Design a protein around this ligand. Structure first.
Ligand SMILES: CCS(=O)(=O)NCc1ccc2c(c1)OCO2
Ligand SMILES: [Cl-]
Ligand SMILES: [Cl-]
Ligand SMILES: [Cl-]
Ligand SMILES: [Cl-]
Ligand SMILES: [Cl-]
Ligand SMILES: [Mg+2]
Length: 348
């Protein structure tokens, strides 16, 4: 067991191992509080997150367990991983606080698409890395659910990591109106058309790639219905085959109320873009999620010929998510989480 020291930072007690020095507040959401620190064991600048009220309800205790299982599993160059997890508790009986440690992220994709000139070579390398990370995530039957520029960390050498997995967190208020939180979402999940799957993340990659090529948001809708009209004007209205797959009768009735529109010519929308970029966008931005290109298929597309290496695009170890259908008490979820904290083995 390491030695811990205590300090109060912005009205919050932090109790951490001595290896973590020079802590300074960097933000606080409803998920918890975050400090920057120097890790004397590794020599890295790190983010330390102290979870807020991790075991306050069955819902919160299960969310804490889900987040810790997912972070312990992800071991890939293009995905956020766990450097450390700790509690100051010496037994299950006194266990209340959880702290997560990751590499400290600098810029996101928002702070390079807004303020930089990107070559086609930059767009190839950035989208290649997102798809390399997604092939790995999808191989474990994990859906990200919230890919957008603020969830992509990028360094001076244009190297990218995926972070901030959707842990079923987002509220109705957060998805209402003129908001970036909804602009990257697939139409089948934005309007609850059907049981969604991993294809929703490929729609999001389409919206991100378009914005890197033009410097503008592809579908900046003022509400759910405005955004659907922007989507259908580009990709066309649905045919009978997709309409049969929409499970809501009322959603089917609303779609049928709209005048029929054909798919637009994407070379006349993405003026001057690499023809291979245009071709890949037409394969991602497909309304019927059964017919979208997969991450594994997209890595083999001629747009990425410069970067593609089929011997260096790894898949994940098997991931057991059977806990998701399990009905447990607060203290049972808390005991499972305790065991995951004490069994953690740091990376090399
Ligand atoms: C695994 C679900 S997640 O990707 O949403 N976790 C977010 C997170 C945010 C800040 C952090 C952190 C973890 O550890 C230190 O600072
Ligand atoms: Cl220590
Ligand atoms: Cl990492
Ligand atoms: Cl504790
Ligand atoms: Cl964003
Ligand atoms: Cl597993
Ligand atoms: Mg985020």
């Amino acid at each position: 067991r390491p030695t811990f020291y205590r300090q109060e930072l912005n009205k919050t007690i932090w109790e951490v191992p001595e290896r973590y020095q020079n802590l300074s507040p960097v933000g606080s959401g409803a998920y918890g509080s975050v400090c920057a620190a120097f890790d004397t064991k590794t020599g890295h600048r790190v983010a330390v997150k102290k979870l807020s009220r991790p075991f306050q309800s069955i819902i919160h205790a299960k969310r804490t367990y889900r987040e810790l299982r997912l972070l312990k599993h992800m071991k890939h160059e293009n995905v956020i991983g766990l450097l450390d997890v700790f509690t100051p508790a010496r037994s299950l009986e006194e266990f209340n606080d959880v702290y997560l440690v990751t590499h400290l992220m600098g810029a996101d994709l928002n702070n390079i698409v807004k303020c930089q000139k990107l070559t086609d070579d930059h767009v190839q390398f950035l989208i290649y890395q997102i798809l390399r990370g997604l092939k790995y995530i999808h191989s474990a039957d994990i859906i990200h659910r919230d890919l957008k520029p603020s969830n992509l960390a990028v360094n001076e050498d244009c190297e990218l990591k995926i972070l901030d997995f959707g842990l079923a967190r987002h509220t109705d208020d957060e998805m209402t109106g003129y908001v970036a939180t909804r602009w990257y979402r697939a139409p089948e999940i934005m309007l609850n058309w059907m049981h969604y799957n991993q294809t929703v993340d490929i729609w999001s990659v389409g919206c991100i790639m378009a914005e890197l090529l033009t410097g503008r948001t592809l579908f900046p809708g003022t509400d759910h219905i405005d955004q659907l009209k922007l989507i259908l004007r580009l990709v066309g209205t649905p045919g009978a085959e997709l309409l049969k797959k929409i499970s809501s009768e009322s959603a089917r009735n609303y779609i049928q109320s709209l005048a029929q529109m054909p798919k637009m010519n994407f070379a006349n929308v993405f003026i001057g873009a690499n023809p291979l970029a245009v071709d890949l966008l037409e394969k991602m931005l497909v309304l019927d999620s059964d017919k979208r290109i997969t991450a594994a298929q997209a890595l083999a597309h001629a747009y990425f010929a410069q970067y593609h290496d089929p011997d260096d695009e790894p898949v994940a170890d098997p991931y057991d998510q059977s806990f998701e259908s399990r009905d447990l008490l607060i203290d049972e979820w808390k005991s499972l989480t305790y065991d995951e904290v004490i069994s953690f083995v740091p990376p090399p």
